């Protein structure tokens, strides 16, 4: 198994420079061309430039002139793109791939590394329960919820009774407001099976290295 | 540049059924080397993309062979031979044959499934909420088809646009679906001054709205 691991989510300040990698392992590092490619949030694919470990060798958009540049560690089989000049427009997930050869295309990807560009304080989310009892819910399945208020940046991560309830579970799209962000998760079970069986919200904001669980009660 | 025309949508497609997405090139991309340099490739709602054909016709390592693509150097097809639910997504031409390289916008696959109603639940503010002098009533609308909803929020029976917060779902991956929520936030002041709190749904599956409803005292 190829594995391209992208370096974590960074929140800078705009006219700073980031400097995010890509450590590819699974094949020879230096065989490969490894590429780097820009999504803004509700976008399409811009391509950043290209780089191959054994030369070393580059090719690069120029849209990105001066503000991109794509190094690699042969030591580490490490590849690093550097980001220069930061504005909000470069908030992005960046993604790096690996191109499987003579013109074959990214045929393995990395996970993404979201930067968000901004002046704005991290702020820890506040998560509020949601639970029935003013109006007697449905008949068969219960629906409850986490609402997941006031914090910045993206991203958060949102699982209940830690990941062991995955069924049933849909987790909306943050929306930002106000320089904060707000989200919001329900989980729809059996009748019968709350509360006696406990649920449970876990949300995760590692750019305040807070999570917080939320019991959701009646 | 060189400049991918791709469609942003597709028709819905029948659960099972054939595919196609094409894509337009502003340049021919074969070269005079014999290459052409044209791939596909699909990115799922929340995941990094998957490269599903190189070279226009050539299928990927990791592709399932439901895909296919072809073209005349110019213009291309990607074909799906049976759709799954789990297709679902944004699929993407590229080209490598000129600096700089570029995508297409993409286009987004859906899955046409029956009809289904939302399944409309409301949440009154959390104490906690409250004690921060904050109220936000929530309405999460989950599970429908097809994806055109509105939602409309009344206090003491009265439309209010302000402090309204929406959000959906892509298409489940699994059953075809949407959902939206809906949070009204308003300071605990104002919720504390009005009585009925009302989320009502507009959709094809209902003459009259879905409303869920609850009563502060
Ligand atoms: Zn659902
Ligand atoms: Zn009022």
């Known amino acids: 198994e190829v594995q391209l691991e992208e370096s974590g989510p960074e929140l800078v300040r705009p006219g700073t420079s980031v400097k995010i990698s890509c450590k590819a392992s699974?094949?020879?590092?230096?065989?490969?061309?490894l590429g780097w490619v820009k999504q803004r949030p509700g976008h399409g694919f811009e391509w950043i430039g290209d780089?191959?470990?054994?030369?070393?060798?580059?090719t690069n958009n120029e849209k990105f002139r001066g503000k991109a540049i794509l190094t690699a560690d042969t030591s580490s089989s490490t590849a690093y793109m550097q980001l220069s000049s930061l504005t909000s427009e470069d908030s992005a997930v960046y993604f790096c791939?690996?191109?499987?050869?003579?013109?074959?295309?990214?045929?393995?990807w990395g996970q993404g590394t979201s930067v968000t560009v901004s002046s704005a304080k991290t702020t820890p989310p506040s998560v509020y329960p949601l639970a029935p009892g003013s109006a007697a819910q449905t008949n068969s399945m219960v629906t409850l919820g986490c609402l997941v208020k006031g914090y910045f940046p993206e991203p958060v991560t949102v699982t209940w009774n830690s990941g062991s309830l995955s069924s049933g579970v849909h987790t909306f799209p943050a929306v930002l407001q106000s320089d904060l962000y707000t989200l919001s998760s329900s989980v729809t079970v059996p009748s019968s099976t709350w509360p006696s069986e406990t649920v449970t919200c876990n949300v995760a904001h590692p750019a305040s290295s807070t999570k917080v669980d939320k019991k959701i009660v009646p | 540049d060189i400049v991918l025309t791709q469609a942003a949508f597709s028709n819905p497609v029948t659960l099972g059924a054939s595919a196609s997405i094409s894509c337009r090139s502003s340049?021919?991309?074969?070269?005079?080397?014999?290459?052409?340099?044209m791939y596909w490739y699909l990115q799922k709602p929340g995941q990094s993309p998957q490269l599903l054909i190189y070279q226009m016709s050539k299928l990927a390592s990791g592709a399932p062979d439901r895909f296919s693509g072809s073209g005349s150097g110019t213009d291309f097809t990607l074909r799906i031979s049976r759709v799954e639910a789990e297709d679902v997504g944004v699929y993407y031409c590229?080209?490598?044959?000129?600096?700089?390289?570029?995508f297409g916008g993409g286009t987004k696959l859906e899955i046409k499934r029956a009809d289904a109603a939302p399944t409309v639940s409301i949440f009154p503010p959390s104490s906690e909420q409250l004690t921060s002098g904050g109220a936000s009533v929530v309405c999460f609308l989950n599970n429908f088809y097809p994806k055109d909803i509105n939602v409309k929020w009344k206090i003491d029976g009265s439309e209010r646009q302000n402090g309204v917060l929406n959000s959906w779902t892509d298409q489940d991956t699994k059953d075809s679906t949407y959902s939206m929520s809906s949070t009204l936030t308003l300071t605990k002041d104002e919720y504390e001054r009005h009585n009925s709190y009302t989320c009502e749904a507009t959709h094809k599956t209902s003459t009259s709205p879905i409303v869920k409803s609850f009563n502060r005292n």
């Open positions: 590229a080209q490598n044959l000129e600096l700089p390289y570029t």
């Open positions: 340049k021919s991309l074969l070269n005079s080397n014999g290459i052409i340099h």
């Open positions: 780089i191959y470990p054994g030369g070393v060798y580059t």
């Open positions: 791939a690996r191109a499987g050869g003579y013109y074959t295309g990214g045929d393995y």
């Open positions: 699974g094949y020879t590092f230096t065989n490969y061309w």
